[PDB]
Structure formats: structure tokens, C-alpha cells
């Protein structure tokens, strides 16, 4: 919505029209470089083919590597909120009943005299295995 | 919500018409 | 610069600092074009056109 | 900068057929004024090789010898002003906190009560003798 | 959804339900209508109509 909103401001100056091939890109290196990182998020969800956990802990590694360019790193962390904020509601859901619900196995952790609730190694919480033993 | 953020990118369109049209008065000044 | 922006393209490889450099790098590289903007507003018609 | 401002400024004039040589003499005479001096300080600074207090030294007594051009005297003013106030301010952090690094041997006090510090002889200083010796 | 409104009508015809989705579904259908009375108090050119 943020991108689209750009391009319809400067047609406002397209019926005034005199803007140039430079200052169209300018506001492009810009918005290039929003495009580029939601590109290479995008391509590397395609190599990988994760989900649920699987994925919050690939987000939480693009939380380190995307760090020294501010607006890269926020919304990367962005991102990672947003993955966590249903996940950890997951989370919550399981501690106040134990409701395991499972759209497409979102939680880790599947319902089993058993006692075989056995994480899983599928899918990681955004921190290490010992949270998830936790 | 979808007004409010026409206006957030109309100022941004504000203070560029501003800084280019402070470059003509160097270029209408000293000129 | 710009063949330094096209060898910026890394995960994150071989130092954090090393695109944290060019990230700055694309930030000076930010300003020139801003000056080359205030110029192509004095081409067209809306000063004198001399070198 | 400031001469090639000025050069901007009379093509302004250029732009109808209007110039004369002594029209644009009244330019070429603050400027003759300007360069005749500036290389006359650029010439002492380098042949001689001059480096250290010497070059502070010798800034100092053109302004001095200098009463009689008021413009001739604002130039060597703002050099040696502009030559000085850096040099001024590594003194000014070596009298205030008591170390000293020197990047390229730029003050006149280098390395050599078991630990000496010596003034050189290369740098003669703009100041006083007792005041370079205090 | 205009067609779905117009097989809607029963007495009220195998269950309460699917006459309330559907009035649900009418009450969906008056967003719908409220954004193409803005786009037109938008038309206002005495905003650029493009498109």
C-alpha cells in the first residue's frame, strides 16, 4: 500500500508534466531497495519450502544478517514480529487449556497413558531447543 | 487509514518540491 | 560505486562491517543524485544553459 | 570556489552584446589583486619544503608586513587562521589532557623524569621561545 | 452477490441460518456500495480522474 501510494502522488505531476528521467530515479533507488530485500526474502521462501517454526527461525537468522542498513533491519524485524505474534498466540493457546489445533501443524507439538507429546524436529522456536523443552 | 496515507506521501512530495525549488533560488540568486 | 554495489550482493559473507561500509557507500551515493536532480530542473522550461 | 563563482557571474553579463575588456577589468582587478598575493603565499610554502611551526612562522609575519593592502591582508588572515586553529587544537588537547600522538609528525614536541620530550629544531614556532619552552 | 440475494427470498424455507448468512451477505454488500459513493464525491474536477 506504501508503494502504490508513491506512484499515484508524482501523477499528480504527470498532468503538470515535466518530471524527468532522474528524478523518477531517484525516488527508484529508493524503492528498488525495498523491492530487492522482499525479492530475496521471496526467493529464498522458494528454495526452501519451510513452515510454521521451520520458519520463524530462517526470519530470526534475516534478523542478524540484515543489520548495518537500518531500513533493511526494520522491517526484517517486522517481518519477524509478524511470524511471531500468531505463533506465540499458538503458544499461549496450548498453556492456558492445552488446545491443540492444527491447521496445517503450525505449533511444533502434537497431541499423542501416553505422555508422547516429542516436540518435533521439524520446526524450532525463534530461540534454541531448550525453550522448546521448556 | 487509506487518506491518511495519501497525505504521509504528499508531504514527502512537499518537501521535495521545497528542496528543488530552494537549488533554483541559488540558481535565480547568484545566477 | 556502482560495481561496488554489485559486489555488495552477499547473505551476509566473510564480515558484518563489509556491507555496513557500502550500505554508507549507497547513502553518498544517495546525495550525488540529488544534485543531479536540481539540475535537470534548470533544463526544461517551467538561469542559463552554459557549461 | 570564490573566483569561479565570479566566473559564473559574468557570463551573466556575456549573455547580450554588452562586453568590453575594462567592464570586466573591474572584475580582473580584485582578482589580479587576489591571485598576485595568494601564489606569493603559495610560493613561500613551497620550495623551502616547509613543514612544522615554520610554516605558522612564516603565515604569521605576512600578516604583520602586510598593513598596507586591506584585501591583501584579509587573505593571509583567514590562512592563517585556517592553518593555525587546527594546529591550535592539538596543542589545546595536549595541554588539557597529557598524551600525545602525532600522526605524521606534526608538532613541534616529538617522543625523545626517565622520559624525554624535546623541542625540535626543523619546527621554528610562531609563538614566543618561553612560551614554546613552557 | 446480487444474483445470490435474489434466489435468497423463501418465507423462510429449509432453515433460519442461510437467511441470516445471507442478510450477513446484504451486509456485506453495503461496503461495497459505500466505496463507489466516495470514488464519485472524488470525481470532484471543477482530484485528476485517471484511472
Redesign the interface.
Known sequence: ??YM??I??????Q?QG?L?L??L??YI?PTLRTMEVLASIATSLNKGECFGGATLSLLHDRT??????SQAQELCLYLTKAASAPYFDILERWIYRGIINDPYSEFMVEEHWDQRYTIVQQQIPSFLQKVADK | AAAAAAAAAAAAAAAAAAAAAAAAAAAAAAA | IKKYTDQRSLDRAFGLVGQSFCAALHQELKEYYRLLSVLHSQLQVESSLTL
Not at chain 1, 499515484?8 to 505531476?13: D, F, T, V, W
Not at chain 1, 542478524?64 to 542498513?69: R, V
Open positions: 500500500k506504501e501510494i508513491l499515484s502522488q508524482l501523477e499528480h505531476l498532468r515535466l524527468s532522474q528524478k530515479w531517484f533507488q542478524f544478517g540484515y543489520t548495518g542498513d
